[PDB]
Amino acid sequence: TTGLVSIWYQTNYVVPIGAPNTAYIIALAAAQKNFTMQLCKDASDIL
Amino acid sequence: LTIGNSTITTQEAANIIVGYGEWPSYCSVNRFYTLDTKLWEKSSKGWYWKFPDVLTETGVFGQNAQFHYLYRSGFCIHVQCNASKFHQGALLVAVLPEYVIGTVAGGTGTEDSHPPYKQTQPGADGFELQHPYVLDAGIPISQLTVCPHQWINLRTNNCATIIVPYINALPFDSALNHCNFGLLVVPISPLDYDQGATPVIPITITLAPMCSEFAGLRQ
Amino acid sequence: LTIGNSTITTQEAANIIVGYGEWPSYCSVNRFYTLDTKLWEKSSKGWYWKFPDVLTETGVFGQNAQFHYLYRSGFCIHVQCNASKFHQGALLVAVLPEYVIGTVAGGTGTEDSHPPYKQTQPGADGFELQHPYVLDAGIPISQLTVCPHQWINLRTNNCATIIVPYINALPFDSALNHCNFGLLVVPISPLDYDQGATPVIPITITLAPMCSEFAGLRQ
Amino acid sequence: SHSTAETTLDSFFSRAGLVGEIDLPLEGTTNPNGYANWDIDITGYAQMRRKVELFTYMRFDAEFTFVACTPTGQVVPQLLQYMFVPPGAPEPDSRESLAWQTATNPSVFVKLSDPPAQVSVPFMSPASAYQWFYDGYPTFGEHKQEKDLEYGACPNNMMGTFSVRTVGTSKSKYPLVIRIYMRMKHVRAWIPRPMRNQNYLFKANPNYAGNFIKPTGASRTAITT
């Protein structure tokens, strides 16, 4: 019912000597113009 | 043009090289084929590929190209070699039309039967040259540059492109019956690097043919 | 349009019938599909077919339609019934939109689990109606004519055609997820013939959709 | 240069040289049947062969001549026959074979006392141009597992066959020695191919041997002059 997205290694990671051997990755997300909701829901969790 | 989540990061500054100053011809498309990454090592001697028989397994339209007989397309071949700014190496890319694979006939008796199927099928990954000086065919490696080629230097560039039209043995050509061409990649100066650095150099090759033909016959 | 030597003899005098006086629509081709011949017998009660799931095995583009999700086409359905000049019989052809298959819940206890896969899959050949008066669904056979149909009489005609556009439960429609329609063929007057004559009446049905869509998604 | 006629591809291929050597002794075992045959093997001689692989696609015609002489070089009163065998036509099998009198096979009556005569054959290849390398199977048949009768002689590459015979029911009285020369008039090539330089192992198959030699080793070291 739902779609899937994944990240794969196309090639190996190469780094020059004298540089850190690993890094960290971050990502951003948003909504497009044509995105909208239809009907309200009475949802609450905390507290 | 994405298969689910296939949106790779691609270069926008390719070095445009034309072949004989001639664009391809009509009957005589946006899918970018992706191959597995190649690892370049200090003791590596270079690889080779055979088209279109091996090409019919990597591409999305290549997989369907197994069942397509004829071709009508223009080839834009992209070879990509990413590396750091302090790495050392040199690579040669060239295309050899009508590249006949040279079988090796060793042993005490210089005679062999029809070429074995093991030698004819190296797989979709590719094979390594036994003696890359003769391209495993008795053909000197010094003379490749007469054919279309491109110089790849780590200090100079990271990518290259080759464009070649269809050249066949007959005016009426068959792609699944007649082997067209192949690609040759061989190091000229062995790669060197400092101790502890990354010892693997990635190689990727990208091509984008337009379309093929089904054909078919009945009795 | 021949697969080797597939050049059949076809009729050129079809009786053109339009559906609601409306031609099909655009996005919201020459391959003629061939099915196995059907044998009509004196004790036969009529058959039924389900599309597009069963259609994805007989057609040349139908076989590829197994992997195609959406549709965009117009349906020109040709039903052909060849017979001699001294044969007797009558046949009804009609299309029932949103034709839900009626499962049979017998036994001492009137309760069954989720529909078995045996009942859901009758094969590519087709299935026979257990009680054709209710179409095996509790729906009277007297009322089929309100839906589009055609009268086939041996004394009158030998062929008929039906044209129907795409009608689905949602503005955005899925062909591999939602069952669209089906065809119903049922005899009204049992066939009669003289002793020693040919007891088998051939039935062939031909349809020619235009094209389908691949779709696809990734995570 | 201005006078570049001697430097063109025609001039680079304008030379008549040794192509065939067939002997017909009066008595022996090389030809105890009084006749012989010769297949056109340009690749047999590495001299003329090495020239052609400089290009891959090439077109060429040819002309052929015949010389009859004794081991001492005397001239004798006899006649000899020459005929071109197309791939479809069958080769002769006996001295009294029915193929000699076949009308569709062109043949000429020649007296060897007459100074040598020369004949030419035009483009016989069914394809547009010759291909010295066929990147595939030697046979053009639909079977790829058996030893077909068409193996070796494929219609797409073969360019004919010659046979020699001394016609006459009366027995020949003299020994014969025959030498064959060929030359080309029109030559045209399309795509260059890197030159084949290393040692050859087979007569018509580019397969090579494991003992590696280099074309040159004269220079000892870079510092050495």
PDB file of C-alpha atoms in Angstrom, chain A residues 4-6, chain C residues 217-219:
ATOM      1  CA  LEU A   4       9.555   2.230  -0.637  1.00  0.00           C
ATOM      2  CA  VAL A   5      12.755   4.235  -1.100  1.00  0.00           C
ATOM      3  CA  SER A   6      16.290   3.033  -0.375  1.00  0.00           C
TER       4      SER A   6
ATOM      5  CA  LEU C 217       6.960   2.733  -8.057  1.00  0.00           C
ATOM      6  CA  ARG C 218       9.964   2.716  -5.737  1.00  0.00           C
ATOM      7  CA  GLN C 219      10.637   3.201  -2.035  1.00  0.00           C
TER       8      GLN C 219
END
